From a paper:
TrkH, KtrB, and more distantly related KdpA belong to the superfamily of K+ transporters (SKTs) that are found in bacteria, fungi, and plants. TrkH or KtrB proteins assemble with their respective cytosolic partner proteins TrkA or KtrA to form a stable complex. To better understand the mechanism by which the Trk system functions, we determined the structures of TrkH-TrkA complex from V. parahaemalyticus in the presence of ADP (TrkHA-ADP), ATP (TrkHA-ATP), or ATPγS (TrkHA-ATPγS).
In the presence of ATP, the N2 domain has a rotation of 36° relative to the N1 domain when compared to the structure of a TrkA protomer in the presence of ADP. In the TrkHA-ATP structure, the tetramer-to-dimer conversion in TrkA moves the N1 domain almost 13 Å away from TrkH. In TrkHA-ATP, the neighboring D4M1 helices form an angle of 45°, while those of TrkHA-ADP is 59°.
Residue numbers in the entry:
A (entry chain D): 1 to 28, 36 to 61, 68 to 90, 94 to 117, 123 to 153, 178 to 483
B (entry chain C): 1 to 29, 37 to 61, 68 to 91, 93 to 120, 124 to 153, 178 to 483
Write the structure that this text describes.
């Protein structure tokens, strides 16, 4: 099936991935250079005997097929077992805080991996239009420059030397919840960093596709204040979050001073809630239900045209508000229902497809919970772990045993696939399984 | 809003409910008689001053509302001496047909009435199940009577074969009419374990629980009965799921190598799997010879509950079937959105009208599920025991097996009231009280 074209294109892809492998070498390192050489060699052998050129789902799978391989070689010789080495590689990879447990070059590379993951996750994410020319690089390069320079200067304000500010900035690009120390923000708590970082968390997560027009000099920004459905819904949930935090604070009478109670409390609620992953609280001053509630909050993750693939506003919104239309259906079946919350008329093909996706998603959820518990994992610690795993924050808080090294490595391989599913569209592998497809 | 016409009909309804309140009075060795008199008095004061006569959802809510109005009065006063909230909870436990035990301990007359309550609940739930056509003449009362006579007589004679005196056979029969999971002793079959009863009862369980409205044609005399073998999908899907259940039981038996003899292992093992699975509620196993996942798996099995036209209202074959098969259509939609999908699993062409409602019902159901889990844990209940309890509660079997502490006398009584409403919600369509909360409705 035209294998000659596929070999050269795939080889070029592996070589291109390999070019971006000199990151630790800047910090005087050799295995990563070796990976570039081996894959480049692969590209070279693929490239020359075959010259001819010319499905798509196969390509997407091959895309993230690649991303998965690679990044596992320098760890078998960090002395850790091969399954654990692979698991750790994925742990560093995909911005998942999968801690079971370093060199200063490797650590820089790990934060760099977060950088690579962050840019990579949002580039083919709005490039699915042919299945459902490279000029977007510049406009993306400008927005990024604004994001990183702003973060670095913001860290600088505290007074740390630029290397430290840059180090923290690299750590927070694709937040997995990692920092210099295991405590996410407990080890260093300058007030300016906390306030500024929380602002970064709010601004950086929900929406950048909407502001793509910002590249054009039309000045369409003040229009978005009004009639933006996302803004009203999102503000209602977040403001409600603030009010409940305030109420909880008053009920327990935790901190009398405003600054610690508001910044620290707000920081914990926002950080855990926003799927950030920076957690430094054992939730003892909070009741037990707050960890459970927060975990449910963790499920709500990502925004439309955002870094994280999770349940979105429009999907839940459609179910609820469309659900309201269904409530109206319950009142009367003779009654035509057509309501358009959005400015456009909405076609009935997409809505049905979306909730169907949710139903299949539920099936996957059952598979993940049942499978992980089924493999030999404990009912509760794994239960919290699966909730956390699907979201991609970290270890399960309830009945804490954060580091699972002694769990079965084949299941660990399953954990890798599950977290990968957490980031990538889950049903790509699903298309592979079906018997009608063969 | 024409209140004079609601007063007489509702009063008549209360009096009618009261008419069948003489059940313990047959067993000498008064409060229930008092309930009949008080409600009859209520009907009387609502019948003579008003002579006039004349929405519908209010009436259905009201019918369900009537249950439990006079099901809790005789328990505050007297052998059952228990607190008022607990008395109400206990009343609902017996009445709801759920197995909500707070006590260990099972008056002969009161107990007879309790089993009788199971009889009342069993016929009552089925009768109004198909009477919802005006919103979505009483000639059915004899055709259901023949079928019911067949069911009760068959159960009694079946128990009689074992060799117990007819009173004991009838007692067990009354106990198994609507299946709470109760017997003379707390263990379902541990106290008496005769083999004929076990085999016959399992047959009873399989036949009784699915689907009897298909066999409503059994009353008019015709030959339609052989045709159903190839006629219905329900048989292929249901048989496939049950057979798979048998195979997994067989394979888990051979993996652990539990019992070498085939009589005990197949009947006891099969009995346990089917009984826990079929929303029956008869449980005598602590699941130690089974791994821990089997209790979890069984609880998931408990969620699958009811057949279309069956006594219990729980997720069904057609709903899940629609999601998966229609889901398959959805699966085929990722391949080409340009591709028209129209498929009819059933004999008729199926309309796109009802189908959105089914999954919408599931979505709303999930919302309710979140409310129940979050609310019960939120009230002050424990993490895990409550979690198993809510799964079990929605189904209406009994206690959560995992980390078992079935009896919860010391749990908060207002939440216990919430538990009562939750289990009732399991039995009746949850939404029937959801149309009250909406502000657009007022």
């Amino acid at each position: 099936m035209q294998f000659r074209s596929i070999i050269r294109i795939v080889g070029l892809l592996l070589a291109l991935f390999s070019v971006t492998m000199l990151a630790p070498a800047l910090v005087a390192g050799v295995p990563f250079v070796t990976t570039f050489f081996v894959l480049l060699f692969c590209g070279a052998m693929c490239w020359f005997p075959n010259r001819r050129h010319k499905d798509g789902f196969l390509i997407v799978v091959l895309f993230w097929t690649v991303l998965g391989s690679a990044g596992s070689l320098p760890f078998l010789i960090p002395n850790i077992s091969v399954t654990d080495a692979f698991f750790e590689s994925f742990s560093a990879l995909t911005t998942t805080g999968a801690t079971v447990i370093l060199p200063k070059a490797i650590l820089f590379y790990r934060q760099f991996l977060q950088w690579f993951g962050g840019m990579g996750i949002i580039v083919l994410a709005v490039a699915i239009l042919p299945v459902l020319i490279a000029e977007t690089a510049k406009a993306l390069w400008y927005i990024y420059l604004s994001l990183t320079i702003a973060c670095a200067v913001a860290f600088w304000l505290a007074g740390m030397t630029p290397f430290d500010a840059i180090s923290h900035s690299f750590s927070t690009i694709a937040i997995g919840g990692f920092s210099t120390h295991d405590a996410s923000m407990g080890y260093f708590d300058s007030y300016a960093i906390n306030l500024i970082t929380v602002v970064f968390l709010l601004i950086s997560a929900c929406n950048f596709t909407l502001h793509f027009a910002a590249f054009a000099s039309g000045g369409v920004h003040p229009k978005y204040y009004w009639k933006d459905p996302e803004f009203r819904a999102f503000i209602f949930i977040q403001v409600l979050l603030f009010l409940v935090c305030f109420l909880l604070l008053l009920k327990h009478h935790s901190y009398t001073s405003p600054y610690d109670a508001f910044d620290q409390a707000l920081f914990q609620t926002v950080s855990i809630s926003t799927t950030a992953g920076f957690t430094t609280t054992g939730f003892a001053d909070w009741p037990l239900f707050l960890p459970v509630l927060l975990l449910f909050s963790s499920f709500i993750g990502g925004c439309a045209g955002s870094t994280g693939g999770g349940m979105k506003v429009i999907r839940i919104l459609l179910l609820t508000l469309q659900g309201a239309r269904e409530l109206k259906r319950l009142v009367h079946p003779r009654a035509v229902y057509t309501i358009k919350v959005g400015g456009s008329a909405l076609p009935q093909r997409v809505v049905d497809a979306v909730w169907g996706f949710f139903s299949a998603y539920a099936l996957v959820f059952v598979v993940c919970m049942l499978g992980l518990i089924a493999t030999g994992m404990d009912e509760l610690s794994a239960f919290s772990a699966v909730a956390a795993t699907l979201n991609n924050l970290g270890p399960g808080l309830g009945e804490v045993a954060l580091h699972f090294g002694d769990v079965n490595d084949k299941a660990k391989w399953v954990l890798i696939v599950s977290m990968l599913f957490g980031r990538l569209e889950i049903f790509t592998l699903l298309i592979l399984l079906t018997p009608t497809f063969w």
